[PDB]
Amino acid sequence: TTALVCDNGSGLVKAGFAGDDAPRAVFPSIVGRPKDSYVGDEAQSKRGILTLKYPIEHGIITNWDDMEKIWHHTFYNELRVAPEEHPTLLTEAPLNPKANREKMTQIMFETFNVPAMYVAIQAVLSLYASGRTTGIVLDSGDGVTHNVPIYEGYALPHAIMRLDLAGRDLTDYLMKILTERGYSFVTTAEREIVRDIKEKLCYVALDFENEMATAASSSSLEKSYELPDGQVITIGNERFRCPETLFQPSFIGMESAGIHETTYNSIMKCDIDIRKDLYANNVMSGGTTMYPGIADRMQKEITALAPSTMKIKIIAPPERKYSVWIGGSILASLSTFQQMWITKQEYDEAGPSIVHRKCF
Numbered sequence: 001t002t003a004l005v006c007d008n009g010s011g012l013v014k015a016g017f018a019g020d021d022a023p024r025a026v027f028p029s030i031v032g033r034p035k036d037s038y039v040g041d042e043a044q045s046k047r048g049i050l051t052l053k054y055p056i057e058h059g060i061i062t063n064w065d066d067m068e069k070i071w072h073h074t075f076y077n078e079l080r081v082a083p084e085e086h087p088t089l090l091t092e093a094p095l096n097p098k099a100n101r102e103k104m105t106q107i108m109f110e111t112f113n114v115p116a117m118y119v120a121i122q123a124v125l126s127l128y129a130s131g132r133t134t135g136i137v138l139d140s141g142d143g144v145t146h147n148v149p150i151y152e153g154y155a156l157p158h159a160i161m162r163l164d165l166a167g168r169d170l171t172d173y174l175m176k177i178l179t180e181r182g183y184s185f186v187t188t189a190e191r192e193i194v195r196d197i198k199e200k201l202c203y204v205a206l207d208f209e210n211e212m213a214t215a216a217s218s219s220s221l222e223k224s225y226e227l228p229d230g231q232v233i234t235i236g237n238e239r240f241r242c243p244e245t246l247f248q249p250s251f252i253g254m255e256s257a258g259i260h261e262t263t264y265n266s267i268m269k270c271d272i273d274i275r276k277d278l279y280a281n282n283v284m285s286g287g288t289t290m291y292p293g294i295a296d297r298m299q300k301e302i303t304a305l306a307p308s309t310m311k312i313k314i315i316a317p318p319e320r321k322y323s324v325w326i327g328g329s330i331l332a333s334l335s336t337f338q339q340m341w342i343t344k345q346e347y348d349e350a351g352p353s354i355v356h357r358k359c360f
């Protein structure tokens with residue numbers, strides 16, 4: 001019997017079968033109501049005649065009716081499976097409230113009647129996917145960024161840092177700065193286009209000032225992009241100004257430390273004895289870490305903050321868009337994990353609070 005893995009994200013659901021290389025189903029975490037309801041790709045394409053709901057907000061489920069619709073769509077329409085036949089591994093954000101883990105458990109067992117389930121922390125799975133049980137994860141998605149230090153397989157909750165800046169903020173900022181250049185990116189269709197520009201042409205500069213000076217004095221950094229209707233626009237310093245916001249959040253008026261500083265702060269919250277293990281095992285996870293140049297830049301920035309004798313390694317796997325999912329796939333497949341599933345029987349006897357005893 002094959003386990004399902006469903007990685008529930010603020011922007012995207014990644015779902016598939018444990019053992020697969022990658023999630024079979026990747027679709028927007030959106031529910032539309034005027035059929036009675038629409039989810040994902042279809043909700044997006046039909047958004048004109050629907051009210052859209054975004055039930056996951058900076059990694060936390062906030063609307064359980066809509067989330068039930070997402071999970072229904074995932075099982076029946078995207079994966080074409082009967083939930084009753086499949087143990088299901090779900091993911092959650094670091095520091096997810098206890099009440100949310102219970103609700104997730106109750107819905108899986110009482111609504112979808114799964115035979116077994118488990119809830120795992122997204123950052124922890126990404127670390128596993130990298131081949132490690134010790135390290136510090138920077139997980140940056142569409143809605144939230146976290147730093148999660150993890151030691152011998154378990155997150156250190158008191159050292160976790162949450163930053164409410166992620167990909168959707170970068171897309172919006174790119175819309176703003178392109179509009180400042182003389183283009184017009186304002187509509188919801190235009191947000192989709194700009195997200196595509198972002199994903200194809202943005203990168204992190206090693207030295208922001210130097211890159212701005214190159215863009216000011218030359219066209220060497222410029223790239224062209226054909227809009228749907230064939231109009232060609234040119235992007236120059238916007239390519240690296242957009243992700244620079246990760247390192248300098250005040251560009252969008254956020255009074256927060258950037259991702260190098262949160263990483264450093266998270267390490268410094270940990271026991272001195274393991275700090276060197278964390279510095280040597282910085283793993284990047286999530287779509288918003290996909291920028292070319294980001295690991296080199298992180299290496300530079302962390303080096304400047306850390307002691308001069310410190311060994312620093314930033315690991316940025318090519319598959320890091322899906323490393324949370326991959327981690328869940330390989331966990332659910334593990335022989336030593338089969339005892340860790342919550343069974344339907346255990347739920348039927350103990351109730352939703354079983355999740356606190358068994359998950360983790």
Ligand SMILES: CO[C@H]1CC2=CC(=O)O[C@@H]([C@H](C)[C@@H](OC)C[C@H](OC)/C=C/[C@H](C)[C@@H](O)C[C@@H](OC)/C=C/[C@H](C)[C@@H]([C@@H](C)[C@@H](OC)[C@@H](C)CCC(=O)[C@H](C)[C@@H](C/C=C/N(C)C=O)OC)OC(=O)/C=C\C=C(/C)C1)[C@H]2O
Nearest residue numbers: 120124128129130131132133152153154330331336337360
């Ligand atoms: C087995 O298939 C792998 C991929 C792969 C595919 C392929 O086609 O080709 C094959 C290829 C031919 C290989 O064949 C086997 C050869 C390749 O040669 C270089 C080998 C690759 C390795 C897989 C390395 O990439 C990494 C490996 O190296 C030393 C690392 C292994 C570690 C030990 C594991 C663990 C991190 C991982 O085990 C599967 C996790 C899930 C362990 C989790 C635990 O032990 C936790 C602590 C406990 C308790 C739970 C705690 N929780 C939930 C806390 O929150 O779980 C029971 O980490 C892993 O296992 C990490 C990644 C595995 C992946 C992506 C799967 C191969 O490379």
Ligand SMILES: Nc1ncnc2c1ncn2[C@@H]1O[C@H](COP(=O)(O)OP(=O)(O)OP(=O)(O)O)[C@@H](O)[C@H]1O
Nearest residue numbers: 009010011012141142143144167199286287288290
């Ligand atoms: N190639 C890329 N370059 C830059 N950004 C990218 C790239 N690919 C995807 N992204 C961005 O990554 C985000 C989706 O990432 P991911 O699936 O990890 O987030 P999520 O799980 O939905 O959200 P969160 O983890 O914040 O809850 C989107 O903002 C998307 O535009």
Ligand SMILES: [Ca+2]
Nearest residue numbers: 009010122141
């Ligand atoms: Ca995520």
